Amino acid sequence: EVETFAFQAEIAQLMSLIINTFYSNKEIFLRELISNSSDALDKIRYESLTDPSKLDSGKELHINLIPNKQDRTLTIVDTGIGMTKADLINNLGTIAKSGTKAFMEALQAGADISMIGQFGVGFYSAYLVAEKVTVITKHNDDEQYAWESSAGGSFTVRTDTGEPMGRGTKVILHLKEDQTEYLEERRIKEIVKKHSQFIGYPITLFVEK
Numbered sequence: 001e002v003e004t005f006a007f008q009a010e011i012a013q014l015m016s017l018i019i020n021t022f023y024s025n026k027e028i029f030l031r032e033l034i035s036n037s038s039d040a041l042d043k044i045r046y047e048s049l050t051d052p053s054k055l056d057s058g059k060e061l062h063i064n065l066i067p068n069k070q071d072r073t074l075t076i077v078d079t080g081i082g083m084t085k086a087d088l089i090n091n092l093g094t095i096a097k098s099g100t101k102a103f104m105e106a107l108q109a110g111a112d113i114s115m116i117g118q119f120g121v122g123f124y125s126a127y128l129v130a131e132k133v134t135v136i137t138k139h140n141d142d143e144q145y146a147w148e149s150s151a152g153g154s155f156t157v158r159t160d161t162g163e164p165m166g167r168g169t170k171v172i173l174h175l176k177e178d179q180t181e182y183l184e185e186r187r188i189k190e191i192v193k194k195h196s197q198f199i200g201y202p203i204t205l206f207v208e209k
């Protein structure tokens with residue numbers, strides 16, 4: 001069973017702005033997704049200090065960057081807290097509403113797309129480079145889920161039939177035809193060094209065979 005949901009009006013408006021605005025500094029999507037993963041790692045690490053059993057699903061706290069030229073995909077894997085079904089459908093979207101409204105007002109007031117993170121809606125910068133985004137996630141208190149959106153005002157949520165993850169999130173970016181530079185090893189290295197050099201977790205860039 002695949003459930004289809006409409007995005008909150010403000011979120012749909014933000015996604016349209018990200019996809020339709022002429023903005024060359026697209027590389028910022030990577031630091032935004034790395035920031036989301038770093039926050040998820042911080043959350044599980046903190047919670048594990050009071051309840052160590054929260055790490056039974058995996059002790060390693062890291063981020064993996066996996067480019068795939070054949071599939072034209074860039075995958076960001078983290079062993080963070082993961083997201084529940086309620087987080088994917090309601091919680092994060094509700095939280096993002098105020099930030100989205102504030103960001104769009106700031107953009108009208110003279111701010112630029114790179115400031116997206118200051119409003120806590122950085123996840124949506126994935127649409128600067130991806131035509132479709134697939135989010136595979138597993139939280140300790142829930143089943144493994146697959147969230148997906150090609151924008152256009154809707155998203156889908158289904159129980160993931162694929163390989164079990166243990167705990168964490170996989171963000172699969174199905175890249176736009178003219179955005180293949182983000183699959184090159186030296187380009188990814190340059191972006192990580194420039195914007196995410198002080199992330200407190202190991203960032204491993206997987207090289208293609």
Ligand SMILES: CC(C)Cc1cc(-n2c3c(c4c2CC(C)(C)CC4=O)CCN(C)C3)cc2c1C(=O)NCC2
Nearest residue numbers: 036037039040080082088092093096120123147169
């Ligand atoms: C910020 C952490 C705790 C959770 C998280 C949240 C999100 N995220 C966020 C937002 C959204 C998402 C992912 C989606 C698919 C639920 C969409 C969304 O609105 C809005 C607010 N941001 C602060 C975070 C994305 C990821 C993750 C994650 O665990 N790993 C990398 C991908």
